[PDB]
Design a protein that fits this description.
The structure is a homodimer.
Chain A (H helix, E strand, L loop, with lengths): L10 H7 L13 H6 L2 E3 L9 E3 L5 E2 L8 H8 L4 H4 L9 H43 L2
Antiparallel strand pairs in A: 1-2, 2-3
The complex binds zinc ion (2 copies).
């Protein structure tokens, strides 16, 4: 085994996350193919087919059977290093592997940051409106 | 950073273990040289210069300044894969690295087994002496 933080680098681990996935034999986006593309299954009450790239953290829902997960990952996050990684896990050098984990860490932060921004912007609008409402009354 | 179980594969970690080491500048077995050879410092009250290969688990004490730790590791555990490892950590493949960790796991068990033997042999002596003492008088 490997530390939990690193398991997602492994196809077999990612495939294991797709339990309860509806798109199985006959479909283009099987868990094998989803896993090959970098995805983890992260289902919610609201979107129960929600998947996340483990590396760049793009989230995608609304899957259909004919969908090729690589072509979609490419469409919705063309900046994802993992799509450039040609070698298998065991064929990576530790330097290479450590370089990738750093990038993934940067990606994660980027996603957290951009979230906080969107949330902060949302609160700003609320607060601004509220104070306009207070001017408006007189 | 890396899981604690794996840190010992890193020289700088091993060097860090040598705190209170007496053989410093001028000596053949400086912590840098000891680390380079695979050793971790795990001193006891009784044997306070005790060092252990992280990989094959050979223990060596009674160090003197002119001692070259590679030549000693070679003398007391010539079977230790780590001494064959020419590449630096980052230059290893994960397969390679995982192959090595497996071997280290085997090594560990082998040593735990050989300890239990030594202990079992020790108890046997005590019990033998005990029965002799009793049967005699
Ligand atoms: Zn991605
Ligand atoms: Zn050794």
């Amino acid at each position: 085994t490997l530390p939990p933080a690193w398991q997602p680098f492994l196809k077999d681990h990612r495939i294991s996350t797709f339990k309860n996935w509806p798109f199985l034999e006959g479909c283009a986006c099987t868990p094998e193919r989803m896993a090959e593309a970098g995805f983890i299954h992260c289902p919610t009450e609201n979107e129960p087919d929600l998947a996340q790239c483990f590396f760049c953290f793009a989230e995608l829902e609304g899957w259909e059977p004919d969908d090729d997960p690589i072509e979609e990952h490419k469409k919705h996050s063309s900046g994802c290093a993992f799509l450039s990684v040609k070698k298998q896990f065991e064929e990576l050098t530790l330097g290479e592997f450590l370089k990738l984990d750093r990038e993934r860490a940067k990606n994660k932060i980027a996603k957290e940051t951009n979230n906080k921004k969107k949330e902060f912007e949302e609160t700003a609008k609320k607060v601004r409106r509220a104070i306009e409402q207070l001017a408006a009354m007189d």
